[PDB]
Amino acid sequence: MNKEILAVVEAVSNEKALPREKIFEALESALATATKKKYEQEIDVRVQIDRKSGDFDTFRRWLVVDEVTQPTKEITLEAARYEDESLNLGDYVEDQIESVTFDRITTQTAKQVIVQKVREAERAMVVDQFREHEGEIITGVVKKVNRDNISLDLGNNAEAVILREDMLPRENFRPGDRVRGVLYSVRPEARGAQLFVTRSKPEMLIELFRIEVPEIGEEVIEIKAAARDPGSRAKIAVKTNDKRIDPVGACVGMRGARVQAVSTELGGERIDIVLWDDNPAQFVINAMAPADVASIVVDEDKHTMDIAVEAGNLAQAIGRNGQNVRLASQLSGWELNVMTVDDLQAKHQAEAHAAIDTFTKYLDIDEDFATVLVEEGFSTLEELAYVPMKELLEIEGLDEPTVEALRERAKNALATIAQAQEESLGDNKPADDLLNLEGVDRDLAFKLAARGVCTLEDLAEQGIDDLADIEGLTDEKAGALIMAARNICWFGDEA
Amino acid sequence: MNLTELKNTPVSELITLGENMGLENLARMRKQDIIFAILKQHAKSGEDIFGDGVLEILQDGFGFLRSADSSYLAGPDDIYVSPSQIRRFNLRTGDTISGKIRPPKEGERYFALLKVNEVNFDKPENARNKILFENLTPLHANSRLRMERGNGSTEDLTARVLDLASPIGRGQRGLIVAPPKAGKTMLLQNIAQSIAYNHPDCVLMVLLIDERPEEVTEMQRLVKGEVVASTFDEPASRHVQVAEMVIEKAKRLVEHKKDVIILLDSITRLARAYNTVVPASGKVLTGGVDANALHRPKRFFGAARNVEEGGSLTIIATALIDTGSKMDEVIYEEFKGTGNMELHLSRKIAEKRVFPAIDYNRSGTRKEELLTTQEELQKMWILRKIIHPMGEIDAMEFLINKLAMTKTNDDFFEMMK
Amino acid sequence: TPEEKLLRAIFGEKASDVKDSSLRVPNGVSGTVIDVQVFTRDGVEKDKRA
Amino acid sequence: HYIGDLVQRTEVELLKTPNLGKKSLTEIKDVLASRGLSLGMRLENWPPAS
Ligand SMILES: Nc1ncnc2c1ncn2[C@@H]1O[C@H](COP(=O)(O)OP(=O)(O)O)[C@@H](O)[C@H]1O
Ligand code: BEF
């Protein structure tokens, strides 16, 4: 009995993978799946065999929840006065006494459970390693290639998987080659593959440099950030502490040697090494290289950067798929816009001096006063609504009638915004065909349109439950009204 | 109804009570079973019970409430407590949990505690608003506790002897080194009676280890407070059980800012019991002890400390020597340097019927200035100096003579001058 | 694998015994057993019914 | 006596019924809620046998 359990727990081979705690948790699960067969009532039975102290004791988990099905494990939130349960959750009991013990089929079940758990413990150890050793590039020989993933080995039963997005779109894969990658994820209690290696994630390139460039690793060239389109293009912004270091000529090597070497190691991936700057504007300027920009409009609130390249290099500035921008949009994490080609491509002198259509009636006491003022900007129209008098004194012509007209126009704007709010709040529009229906007055029509229908044809296609939660009516008058509607719409045969 | 209100009553009285309650004559079952059946009948009558018990946790998770007269042992009168209360209040070992209880149905064995009412004579919020024992700052003995009775009796001798040799304070760790036949048990009785009659403000709790049943009866109804004993009718397992009971109870009561005095006799017996209960580690040292078999006794003797923020824990423990064996000698070696208070009882003066037989030479007190004031220390020092002329036997003569002519400390001091 | 060998050894006697390989009555004929006769080979352990 | 009234009885009144502990309650739960019924509901046509 319990002595046999003690013998078999002291006789397990993988005591490092399956210590006594996990062994008796296995036995808990085995007794649970055994009691699943002992009684027709599918129940959970923790048994806490107390491996060190004694033998098993079948417990009946109250399994606190409002339902009743399988009532051996059904208790509501307060049925805890008896026996001193006194708890809304966690209170458990032992109703089953002298349950079935160790039939041969249950022995076979415990056997298969313990062998699959030895496997699962090997998996748990290798994934603890997977999680701790999240580090440098690792070599491995592949075993199987598929359309969605490939499988790799290192030796000593070190299985790993490289997913489709982790590979390259054109890197030919066949079972038997030594491929190198970077361990990236952590998955403690997975079911399929254990280790996860990638060759396409951005930081991979970082570590590439960290093992290639002799400068990085001693923290003289602090790599700032990087973005990557898998197997296509890797942009990377770096920052140096020393002043006599030239990362434009040191990180790449001698006429494209280090960058070219790490590109061949990547499997044919272009790389753009850029110098990181503490200014996001200058950073997004230099990141889109090779490209020149003379129109920089950076707004911090909406996270945008109007970075317009001069006309002519467009086909090279954006590139295929917008890579040179996308990676930039992934380097800083901002948004970029370029649409202008010839019509005032400055995008900063244009919008500042193109308002001849909206500023037609602003100082409409007499148009012969002065033109509009671009010193304040006159370009947001809403933060402009309330400005202090600390700058409302430089321009000439601000007589008292001017501020009186300002107040009148403020009243007009308040009235128009109130009208707009009334129009946008009344998404009901009760037409005459809705008020003319007998028994449906103005508030009833408002609510009927708030239900979701604003016409007459669809009204006849709703039940009593669709009119439930009615305010002003009740299910019998509901049925009366829906019958009148289906008569005037369907049973009337009129149009 | 309650436990002690029935347990401090004799067995014949409980039998008559159970027969008066209309029950199967209970003179056939033990007293614990008598009270168990009486409580079961009272709960059958249509009401709840109000019980009290000191708390014990094993590796299982729920709690056992042991009673006082049971010497904190396993029995049917021990109350069951669901682990939910332990998860709620984190009630460690050493709570006299007082609360409402219900009778057990079939499939159960003990009464179940419904709700908490009293946590060590305090509000259950103290169960959630308190400080643990391992975190406070242990200090030296600050308060001075007088030992002399004050009647001029013939056993007052012993007390006043100690008072003029080495007084006792709150938070002290006293170890008495004495060979067999030196007057140990009546010394325990004398000092306990004096501390409980002179200072009822302080709380007493006496521990007896490996004594005779008549000694247990003479100890239990003679001194105040709880008298916990563990004789030979229980194995070393139940010995360590009651020992850990009383130590965690004292720890929790001290955490509750209470003064707890623990008399213990002897230490070698509990050390042998522990050696009996701890398995071997492949090696045997001098005397036949283990490596970790000393860790339990060490902890047990060193749990004493003075709590300057509230409450205190003092222990007065006797040791066995001159037993012919080695293990007792090495145990005395290990425990003579760990205590902050050492006293010795001689056997040569004891066998001459000259009591008490104090070793005025090897007697000492750790940092006695915190236990003795200005001219108080002056008097004590000059008397130590004048007794210093090498003497054991006629030194005991001088002490006992000048102590028998006189009644208090100041009388002796002002008549010797 | 010797792991499986020591496994099936320490758990008594166990292997791929899913094989039914058991006699049943022919489909269509009823009856009531009134006698059983078992004969063992010299050396084979006799069951309790024998 | 009849479950016609126990249908208007939730589990709150199970452990409040005197002398309903571990095994009696176990049976009350098993042989009731394993036959398809639910402890606590409401019907409408029990009087007229229709
Ligand atoms: N203070 C005392 N006054 C008179 N007799 C004493 C005193 N102390 C010890 N004795 C004598 O010594 C003996 C001690 O016996 P016992 O109590 O069994 O020793 P122990 O206390 O060491 O176990 C007693 O018989 C008693 O007569
Ligand atoms: F009672 Be004696 F001191 F062993």
Ligand SMILES: [Mg+2]
């Ligand atoms: Mg004695």
